[PDB]
Amino acid sequence: PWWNFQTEHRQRCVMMYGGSRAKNTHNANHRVFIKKYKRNAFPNRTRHHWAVSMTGVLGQRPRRMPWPYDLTSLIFNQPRQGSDKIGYVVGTSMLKTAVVAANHMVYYPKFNQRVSRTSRFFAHDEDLACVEGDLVHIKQCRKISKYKHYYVFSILEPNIEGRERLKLGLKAVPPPLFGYPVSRRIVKLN
Amino acid sequence: TRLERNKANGGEALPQRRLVDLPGVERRRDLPADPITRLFFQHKGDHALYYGTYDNPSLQDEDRIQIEKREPRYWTYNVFTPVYDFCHRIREATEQRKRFVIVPSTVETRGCARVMLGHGLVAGFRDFHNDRAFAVELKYFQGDSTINVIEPCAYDGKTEFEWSPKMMRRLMNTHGIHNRLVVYICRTADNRVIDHIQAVKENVGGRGLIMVH
Amino acid sequence: HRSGKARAFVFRDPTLKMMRAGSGYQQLRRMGMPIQVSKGWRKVDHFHANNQYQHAWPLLSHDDLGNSDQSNNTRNIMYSMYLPKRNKGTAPWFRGADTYSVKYCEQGRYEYQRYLMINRFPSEYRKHFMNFLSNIRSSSGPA
Amino acid sequence: EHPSIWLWYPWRMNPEPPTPGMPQRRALKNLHGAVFTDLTPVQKKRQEQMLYGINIPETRQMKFEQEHPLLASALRQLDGQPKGFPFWYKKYPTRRHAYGNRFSIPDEMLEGYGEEMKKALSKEMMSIQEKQFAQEAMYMERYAEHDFDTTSPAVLAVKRALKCRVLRNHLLTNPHNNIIKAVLANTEKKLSHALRKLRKVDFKKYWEIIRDHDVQDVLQPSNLVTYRQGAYWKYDWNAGLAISTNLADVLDPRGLNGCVETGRSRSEVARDLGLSYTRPLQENEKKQLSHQALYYERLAKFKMEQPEAARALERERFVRKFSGMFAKMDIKSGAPDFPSTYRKLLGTKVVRWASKRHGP
Amino acid sequence: GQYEREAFEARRRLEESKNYPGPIRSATPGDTRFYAGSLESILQDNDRHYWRAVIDDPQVQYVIPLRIRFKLFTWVTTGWEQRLHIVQTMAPRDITIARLIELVTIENQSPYLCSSTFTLAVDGKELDPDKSLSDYGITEHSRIDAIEKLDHLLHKDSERPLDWTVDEMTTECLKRSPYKEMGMQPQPNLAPRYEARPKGYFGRNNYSGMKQE
Amino acid sequence: RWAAKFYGRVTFGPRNYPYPSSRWLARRFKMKKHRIIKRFRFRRYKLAAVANLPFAKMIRVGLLPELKSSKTKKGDDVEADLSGRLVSAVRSSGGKKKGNRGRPKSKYQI
Amino acid sequence: ANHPNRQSGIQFLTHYNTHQRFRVNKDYIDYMHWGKEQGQARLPHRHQR
Amino acid sequence: QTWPCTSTICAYLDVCVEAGEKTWAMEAWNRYCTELKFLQPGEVDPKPVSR
Amino acid sequence: SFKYATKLQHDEMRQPFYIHEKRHGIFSNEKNIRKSRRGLPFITPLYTRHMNLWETDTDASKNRFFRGYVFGQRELHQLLGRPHGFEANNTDGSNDISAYEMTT
Amino acid sequence: ERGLYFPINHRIVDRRIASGVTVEEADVQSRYRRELRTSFATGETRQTIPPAWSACERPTHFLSLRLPVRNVLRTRVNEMHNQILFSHQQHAPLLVPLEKLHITLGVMAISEREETERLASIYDCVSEVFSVIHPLQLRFRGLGTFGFGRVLFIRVVPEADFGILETAVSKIRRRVGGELKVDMKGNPHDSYVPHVTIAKIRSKQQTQFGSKIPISMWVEYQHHDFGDVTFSQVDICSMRGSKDGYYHTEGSVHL
RNA sequence: UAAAUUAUGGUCAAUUGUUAGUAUUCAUAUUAAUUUUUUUAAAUGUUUUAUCAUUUUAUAAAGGUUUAUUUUUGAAAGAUUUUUUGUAUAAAAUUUUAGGAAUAGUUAAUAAUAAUUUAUAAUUUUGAUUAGAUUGUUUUGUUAAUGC
């Protein structure tokens, strides 16, 4: 067995008294990387590949991990994880549809520390109330479309500034000044 | 708990009225502190509405400097804390053979200080109710500091190290010899700040605050 | 070495090194943090059976399983050899019935059990309600 | 005539200028990075309202009257005459409120002195720092709660709004003073970080601010990269303003919540009580909805007078419900996103979709 | 039935009492559109997707879900078959059967069934197109049938469908209603593929309520 | 800058070496840099990058057949409009203009 | 520390918002003149200790 | 510790009937079905669902 | 800690079975046994745990993970208007209670 | 070819059909995407439902907030009427006149044998509530359906003063319902939805004009902004508009 | 801002290299291996049935996947004298590559609609789409041990 010493081994069939039966897999194997391309010729554009990958999920390293103990589990009891999610409703331009952006918990055991993470969800809102920014509660259901398994389960604060901005007519939120990051020196003059 | 069951027997049979006394004898005194040779005035208790907080202090002790907070800038920095800075105030002063240190004042900073003082690593401390600071008078021996080493449990604030009661029981067990030598300060769930010895005498573990010896 | 790895001016305290390891994967495991997504380990009749050793079976000395187990009686062979160990060479770990704390026997029944407030979706409340209804009216069909 | 091209020579430090070397004066972008070749007309009127000298508005006079009528009555009998006791001190509750002249010289002090002295200490000789600070105190006077608070959101927002205006007017006059670039940039970051609590504590002042200092560009989010996942919104959270709302006094808090027993939503309890929570919908959200409101009138006007076409599209759809790909319902069939539920089958077999993922 | 009868009894008594305040609409919950499971299921009119343990008020059912059992000629690829085709229409309680049948005409999505004008029936005797649903007693339970203008002819063999299993499909059949689309000669994909019931499915004779063999 | 200031870890001594870099390693890396600069200045290295290109993927103007220095090699394929821009601009950098901001005008520019 | 502007060292026993006395943007130490009264031009003055 | 509604008291009371033990029913009476009062002529018959 | 304590093939180093019953209702792994694609890689995620750990049930006074100021409680307090402070007088991370709870 | 295979728009499973019936016995093909349509897609404004007896009797007295002169609701309603007509000459005889305009905050079945005496105590309860209240500003935005499409009305939005107004009107509902046993329609404890009826199908037009106003006539305004307006007077009025246009002013309260 | 103990309570943490001025997880060690040794495997024809038919017997070939794989009694267990019901597709957390940017039968609502319905649609730098390696979340090895 594992707790036995190489030369004190006899029988790899059974474990006599007790312990842990397991196959001593061979982690020590010098996995390699066979260069099938040239440093200037890669069939990718963004992320080039030039050395072995560490593969897995719930196995990669730094060992990120699922942690339910976050804002959501501090505020709501849940039947099953992810049910209830609180966020700044951001993006509702799809008629009767909200995009609620609420966080989860990514715990790093090795470091002994956390980082909660962002996610733009789909969230049905029949009758079109929420505006971009209302801190809202979102709950899960039966699905609503390809992508919305949620529905606007409340408001926690309505963006009253925004609602009046619409009433007056303007855009309830001005749009971002710049786009996504590009690589071309776009020369805007006048 | 056994030294009270037969010390509280003094109940008369009647649930008698409780006696009224002088206007005030039940008020807590203030701790004496000379006003002219001093670090800070031991601020009274009556001004308990004048006291601000560590983060946001009042305007008291204009004669004296004020410690500043310890809050980093980026991702790439460790996030210090009063427990870190109090440990390295004390480490540098015991390395400079000072006497009084003006050490940050948070609930578990003076928590660590009251138990260090109970454990004799410190000749004394004082909370002047200074919303920001309080002073730790250091003890020396044979030229060398009694606080041989003093470490924070975490060089970071973003990493709280909750100690299992078994973790804290495997410190007082040096290879079969029960060893309460190195004193470890951990802040339990009850918002108390206690050494690992009373923490494992009641089998609760707490946030790791400091190691010291 | 402006471009070398950093080295501690002094060894860190090994006690601190231990205390920083109460929240890492190898203790999350034996807390219960993972949700087992696969078969996990090979429980039964794969090469590596676990569950037959999971409880305690006395010592089988029926033939030479290697150490002449059947006429050689193996006092010292069991300590050094088959009583499992804490790592290769460490002392025999004994999971005995006298190496567990005597507060374990003195417990009344089901006291370890704490009020578990479990909440289930609304529709899921309805489901399980109609189900234990149907099943108090009739559990098995005719029997 | 074509994208400007710089001829970098690698042996050198850095390139040559462009042959269409378009600009001459570097163009001065905002806090988050957009141009202004000058300030809005609001702000140029706010420059002429700063360099003509602001006079103390009569609101202070009238509040002093209907507030301290006894000091006013004393002044009422004492008007014009060389005063030896300050019957206006309660009118000027602080050094700074006396911005109508120089050196905090309150108006009712210079009577007996020379007209030339009154000319010397009037709004005509105020230094430029004096005049900027004068506007500052006047505005921090009419936006503050009590005349000693200078740390209110509105106080700070207006103070830094005037501040950033004088900064921009400095810059759009003198371009290469880039410590002052990093003056305006950080100052505007704080003015935004204050207005984004103002519009969370009382937006009325916020819009009076908006439309009197014409600064919406310092609230306007810059980078979609952030405001896609809602981080330009998280700020009024982080400051602690997620609940500085008073819905109990704007938006009737009854229907804004689901239930726990039911599980139904905000608008469905608003259904089961009959209340109308819905923003103003733009014309697009209006027309899509009117169109979704007439589909059944279309069905009734379709099947009833052209049941030929009703039947024709019957044939079209009735063949299609059997042709095509799938006909039964499996999870393989109706996993509600085929292309990404089945990744192993998109480049080789199922060339219908060109990418494995199209949604969140 | 012990439910329809009794709920009608009480639904009636409720208005046999004038001393009744009305329902507290905020406390009379609707049904939830979002629920657990997977589908957008429809429960009854009296039923909620959640638990509502109350015995809520038995309210009158304004629009009835009326079920009309048409006759759709199906094509198992071994003949044409007669099978039940209910079209459950949500129809009010005040409507004349004329408008009810206009309604079903608009409601169907298979115009295999609304090619020629048809009529209603209950246990045979037709309903007139001048009276209304309660004029006979149409609930959602009225075990209604539907009868086309050519129902008395389907024992016959003149308009009976000319199938390519046993009959000659000419070219003119290849431009007429079902057969232009039915897909006679199998494409590489067999393009519109239909059902298929064996020639020996039921046994030697066809489907009957009573045991023949 | 698009240039690499240090062509090499000039600063490498033991940590706390109270200087940016020892004069030895500085000379070693100035020799590497003299080789790089003479390679560039002598193969008449010319690069370029114009607006609304992916500015990271540089242009090799010295690898154009109109400005080629080699004869047996083929420099690079470049669209015709962009080529007529660039090589005209390379000719344009052959002189500095009185009445404008002057420039460092080298022989190896032509 | 052998970098210039790191000779000030680690002073945890100052008041400043840092322990790294060379990162305190506040009181850059004159090096030639101070120290007559406080030891070295690093340590804080005897009216701020 | 649950509150047997009228239906449930009736139910258990049938049970007491059939088993023939008055004690069994007297406590359900003492405990729960005491504040049950007949419908006095003025008051509404089926007071609506409230919660 | 040690190896034999990391070896999860003993049970004492494992949270027992009956806790998936105490969580998802007794005998509710069976309805997943009887499932179709049960066994190829995945199974129904078996929720054996300590009960004192559930994100569902427990609170900041039970679960030592809940009073993590770094990201959990800090946002809790920036939401609940409490004074959140690093080494706070209240163990979770709160300096004291907020205006709302103070009053109501 | 342009969407999912088995869309969840059509993913439906009706459970008022018995079990097995759709399996092997019978087909139930219908159109379920109109019985699963939302009040936001129809217009069902959940009006307080009167029970049997109070439904049998006609509204006799009704509390209403009066519109001031020179409104915005009046002018936007005027253009809505212009477009109703230019759309259809059919629909003029269904619209409510502009002068009959009011704001309905409650209807009440009052008996004439105890008529004026009950009106007086009701007036006490109304003035004792609206005495300390300030003049009320409300929001008109987007119409709805009373009587299952029979009545079209410009609901006042709950977004400016519905909180205060409904504390008031549920107080006076409780008072008129449980204190002085008058018949407000619903429960003494319900809150009647304040409403501005702009058109209606009346029993005298049911026969010819229908039991559901044609949602095509008005649905372009179902979510239109009709204006925010201020008002100062809550009046109990008897149901007789032909007096001078506006219904018989059986009591007023200024704010 | 109090000491306390009715005396080891609750069950083992413990690091074993001959270096070569000094800075630095970095040749030589030991542990688990692999290189290495035939004490675990193995066969063909599945089997009934009334019969040219039909009842019974459902995840190992690869197939290249990192926003991914999920589902029931109606089969069977399964018991009676008959018509007998409401529990399922959904998710949620974690996702690689030095030099990092655009991708597409598209997103939502209507729909048991629209191969030409409506629209300011959706994915993305919180690192998207292409391409590359790769089987995805109680099995080991080392270490006193977070790890690796």
TrEMBL record, chain A:
Any one Gene Ontology molecular-function term assigned to this protein's record: structural constituent of ribosome
Keyword set includes Ribonucleoprotein: yes
Family: Belongs to the universal ribosomal protein uS17 family.
Protein name, per record: 30S Ribosomal protein S17-like protein
Cellular component, GO annotation: mitochondrion; ribonucleoprotein complex; ribosome
Signal sequence annotation: none
Top-level taxonomic group: Eukaryota
Sequence intervals crossing the membrane: none
Keyword Secreted: no
Gene Ontology BP annotations: translation
Keywords: Ribonucleoprotein, Ribosomal protein
UniProtKB/TrEMBL annotation, chain D:
Tree of life domain: Eukaryota
Record-given protein name: Uncharacterized protein
Portion of the full-length sequence here: 69 to 428 of 429
From TrEMBL, chain E:
Span list, region Disordered: 178-213
Compositional bias ranges of the Polar residues kind: 205-213
InterPro entries: Ubiquitin-like_domsf
Protein name: Ubiquitin-like domain-containing protein
Species per Swiss-Prot/TrEMBL record: Trypanosoma cruzi (strain CL Brener)
Automatic annotation (TrEMBL), chain G:
Domain of life: Eukaryota
The protein's name: Enoyl-CoA hydratase/isomerase domain-containing protein
